[PDB]
Amino acid sequence: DKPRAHLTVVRQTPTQHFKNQFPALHWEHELGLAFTKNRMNYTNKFLLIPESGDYFIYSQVTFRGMPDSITVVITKVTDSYPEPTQLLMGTKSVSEVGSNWFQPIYLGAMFSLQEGDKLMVNVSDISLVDYTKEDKTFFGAFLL
Amino acid sequence: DKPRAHLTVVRQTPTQHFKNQFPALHWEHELGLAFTKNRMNYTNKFLLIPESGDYFIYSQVTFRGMPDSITVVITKVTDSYPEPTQLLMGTKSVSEVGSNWFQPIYLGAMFSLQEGDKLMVNVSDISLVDYTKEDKTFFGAFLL
Amino acid sequence: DKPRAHLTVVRQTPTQHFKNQFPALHWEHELGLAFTKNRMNYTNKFLLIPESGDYFIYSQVTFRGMPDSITVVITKVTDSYPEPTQLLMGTKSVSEVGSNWFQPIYLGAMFSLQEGDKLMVNVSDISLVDYTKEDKTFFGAFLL
Amino acid sequence: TPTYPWRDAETGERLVCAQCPPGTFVQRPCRRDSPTTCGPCPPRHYTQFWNYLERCRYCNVLCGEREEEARACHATHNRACRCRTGFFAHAGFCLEHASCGTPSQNTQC
Amino acid sequence: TPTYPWRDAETGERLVCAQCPPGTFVQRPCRRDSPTTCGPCPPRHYTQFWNYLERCRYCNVLCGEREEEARACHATHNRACRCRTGFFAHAGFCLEHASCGTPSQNTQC
Amino acid sequence: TPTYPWRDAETGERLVCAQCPPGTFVQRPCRRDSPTTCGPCPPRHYTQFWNYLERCRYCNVLCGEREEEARACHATHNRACRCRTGFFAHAGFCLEHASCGTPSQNTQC
């Protein structure tokens, strides 16, 4: 059948390498609501595309701040070019508000992808990502 | 063909039974933009899954306040266990702002469901749900 | 195969005809991440439905204000009736905040459409639409 | 009388069909034999204009809190809502007017 | 002892099967021959109630910043989190209490 | 000269192919006979690095209000935008600097 994955959030291991850079998120790929099937593999922050075609890709990242803005980017990486492609961006300016806020950012769209492409989700600030439960921050893709 | 439903909001009949609990919403299932087809049935706040497989599930609930936060949860209920599963959560802290605000919360993802499962949408406060039009608050699912 | 389109934002040519009216947006249909295939045609702000069936339709419009509210509406137009149908609305009241804000509004749902139907995206204020990049404001549809 | 192009379901001869008046909808399209059958809009449905819908439009506007029926769901128009006597409309919210206020406008002290 | 309806995988005779106790799950359903096989919940999984799941529920609650394990992931319950000693819960945020404050409540000066 | 693995379209012999330089893209892959055909990037497209794309990248950056072309769309780079003379960049918004202010920084009184 068709390549499908729904991935859920885990605790994020805060990396040191970020030169004005948006780090990728780590995902759960088999426990609870998380699954991958039909050659759609999750390894090392990427979702590996096994088969060329049109994919619906989606993610929500819930942010909590206890920062000017918050941003989610879903990114395509290929070996054929050194720079990634930004497929989707959801960026929201953070109101002065009260420094005890939470917000989801949701993205989903359809893209023509190629066998071998890697999909990942990047955030503006990893320490703002709510990782406490699998229903709040997730990432998925399926071949149409 | 494949089980599909798009459901639209109706006036909510405010229930008394809510012990710190998120009530489910009532939906329209056949009038206007609302439809159900191919054995995907709507009864009594639930969408009945007729066929096991991978489903894309989505909802938007528009909130208007004329409250610390607002929350939507899409919930799976099975007979095989007394407690439901929270598939998706969209939770947003409500800014002091002005007490004349409105906000949508949108959720959509892919889940492996089983014949007999019931899907419902729960909200943090039913009296904040905008029910005035079918394009603002909706709930849907389709077998991929 | 199946009618599919993902469309991306372009610079908007500010029209004069808007009698308390929500203008439609212009889209890119072939460059970068934008594509249309299998008879799903983009002409003159509309997406032409070639084949009757159930479609998943989606859009994000990123708003930036440098206004009481911001609104996106996805609209169905038929020749059989002079008035359009509002399929989806995402409306968000704009907080006093700071007059240097940005926000996405995302919508996506499933609708039964007919061969010949035209889909378009309308906004509350065209001068608030962020058009700077293709990953921020987009519009798409695919036959399920 | 408005009109619309159509191709026959029996044997596809392209004929010009009659539009249905407000309150009605195309129940059966016109043939080479007979004209267009316009049936009346069912309960809680409407058509406001000369149309060729095969299904009437649903009355899909519910009046909220701080709101009353400005116009009922007829077979020729959708339901419409104004604010209640205590309130006036602003930005999409029906809110109070402070006397020491018409459904459309805020009257002053 | 709770019970559940089931139809046999070999030859579909509708028989009433035994529920599995907390800590366990239906590994094999009951047959006309043998009763229901309840297997123990695997690591980081639980069943809190008499059930007929074919798969235990995952311990899917991670404790955040300003948070500690109120209850560990057992085979009979999910993990639960309270705030740390320095903080109390409010609206979903674990925040400080200003002495001149229990994990549930704000104590005052 | 960078290089890339490829399997032949005619008869799948795995051969190492030549990368295309900035400004170009793989129009035809290398064969057992001939090397890699690099064609020039079409209008409003670019490749900045040694690549093996079968399609150049689109110049997908439009300059907004309060913005000017810092760098034009070349065949070897994407378009880039700085703020106009009246404004400086901050958080993603190009905004004014109050004299009694470079496109990158706010100059003071």
**Euclidean distance between CA atoms F45 and A134, whole angstroms:** 40
Between the CA of residue B127 and those of B124, B135, D61, what are the distances in Å? 9, 18, 18
D12's CB contacts (< 8 A; 6+ apart) are: none
Nearest CA among F20, B111, E107, F98 for reference residue A82: F20
- Measure in Å the smallest separation between the Cα of C19 and chain A Cα atoms: 30
Q: Do C104 and A91 touch (CB under 8 A)?
A: yes
Nearest CA among C119, C108, C131 for reference residue C49: C119
**Euclidean distance between CA atoms A89 and A105, whole angstroms:** 10
Alpha carbon C55 to chain centroid, angstroms: 15
**Euclidean distance between CA atoms E34 and C55, whole angstroms:** 49
Number of B to C CB contacts under 8 A, please give it.
Answer: 61
Q: What is the DSSP string of A22-56?
A: -PBPPEE-SSTT-EEETT-EEETTEEE--S-EEEE
Asked if residue D58 lies in contact with residue D38, where contact means CB atoms within 8 angstroms, the answer is no
Asked if residue B96 lies in contact with residue A97, where contact means CB atoms within 8 angstroms, the answer is yes
Please give the class, per CATH, of domain C3-144. mainly beta
Resolution (A): 3.0
Residue that has been written with the tokens 């096989």 in this structure? E37
Backbone angles phi, psi at A127, to 5 degrees: -80, 0
F75's CB contacts (< 8 A; 6+ apart) are: F22, F23, F40, F41, F45, F46, F47, F56
Domain ranges of chain A: 3-144
Q: Do chains D and C touch (3 or more CB pairs under 8 A)?
A: yes
Identity of the amino acid at E29: P
Backbone angles phi, psi at B128, to 5 degrees: -105, -10
At the topology level, CATH places domain E85-109 in Tumor Necrosis Factor Receptor, subunit A; domain 2 (2.10.50)
Experimental method: X-ray
Interface membership of B82 toward E (CB under 8 Å): yes
Q: Do F48 and A83 touch (CB under 8 A)?
A: yes
Alpha carbon C71 to chain centroid, angstroms: 11
H-type alpha helices, C28-142: none
Give the residues across from E105 on adjacent strands.
Answer: none
Asked if residue F65 lies in contact with residue C66, where contact means CB atoms within 8 angstroms, the answer is yes
Between the CA of residue B78 and those of B56, B75, E46, E51, E52, what are the distances in Å? 18, 10, 16, 10, 10
- Measure in Å the smallest separation between the Cα of C44 and chain F Cα atoms: 21
Other CB atoms within a 10 A radius of the CB of residue F1 amount to 6
Asked if residue D75 lies in contact with residue D45, where contact means CB atoms within 8 angstroms, the answer is yes
Between the CA of residue B107 and those of A47, A143, B91, F72, what are the distances in Å? 21, 20, 10, 39
E73, E78, E81, E93: best to mutate for the A interface, most A CBs within 10 A: E93
Between the CA of residue F89 and those of A120, B14, E20, F104, what are the distances in Å? 28, 50, 63, 6
Q: Do D64 and B100 touch (CB under 8 A)?
A: no
Q: Do E91 and B82 touch (CB under 8 A)?
A: no
Other CB atoms within a 10 A radius of the CB of residue F7 amount to 11
Give contacts of C87 with chain D, Cβ < 8 Å.
none
Q: Would you say how long chain E is, in residues?
A: 109
Between the CA of residue C62 and those of A90, A94, C92, E5, E46, what are the distances in Å? 8, 14, 12, 52, 43
Neighbouring chains to E with at least 3 Cβ pairs closer than 8 Å: A, B
Dihedral, E73, E77, E81, E85 alpha carbons, nearest 10? -80
Please give the class, per CATH, of domain D1-84. mainly beta
Helix (H) or strand (E) holding B93: strand B85-93
Q: Which of residues 51-90 of A touch B (CB under 8 A)?
A: 56, 58, 60, 62
Asked if residue C55 lies in contact with residue C144, where contact means CB atoms within 8 angstroms, the answer is yes
Dihedral, F69, F73, F76, F77 alpha carbons, nearest 10? 50
- The answer to whether domain F1-84 and domain F85-109 are alike in fold is yes
Task: Measure CB to CB from residue B86 to each of A35, A135, A140 and give the nearest one.
Answer: A135
Return the beta strands (E) in C39-117 as ranges.
41-43, 46-48, 53-65, 69-77, 85-93, 101-113
Q: Do C80 and D51 touch (CB under 8 A)?
A: yes
Interface membership of F27 toward A (CB under 8 Å): no
- Per the structure block, which two tokens stand in for A56? 């619906």
DSSP D21: P
Residue of chain A nearest E68, judged by CA positions: A132
Domain ranges of chain D: 1-84, 85-109
**Euclidean distance between CA atoms F27 and A117, whole angstroms:** 20
C38's CB contacts (< 8 A; 6+ apart) are: C1, C2, C3, C4, C50
Asked if residue F92 lies in contact with residue C102, where contact means CB atoms within 8 angstroms, the answer is yes
Q: Do C82 and D53 touch (CB under 8 A)?
A: no
Q: Do C102 and F60 touch (CB under 8 A)?
A: no
- Measure in Å the smallest separation between the Cα of F64 and chain C Cα atoms: 6
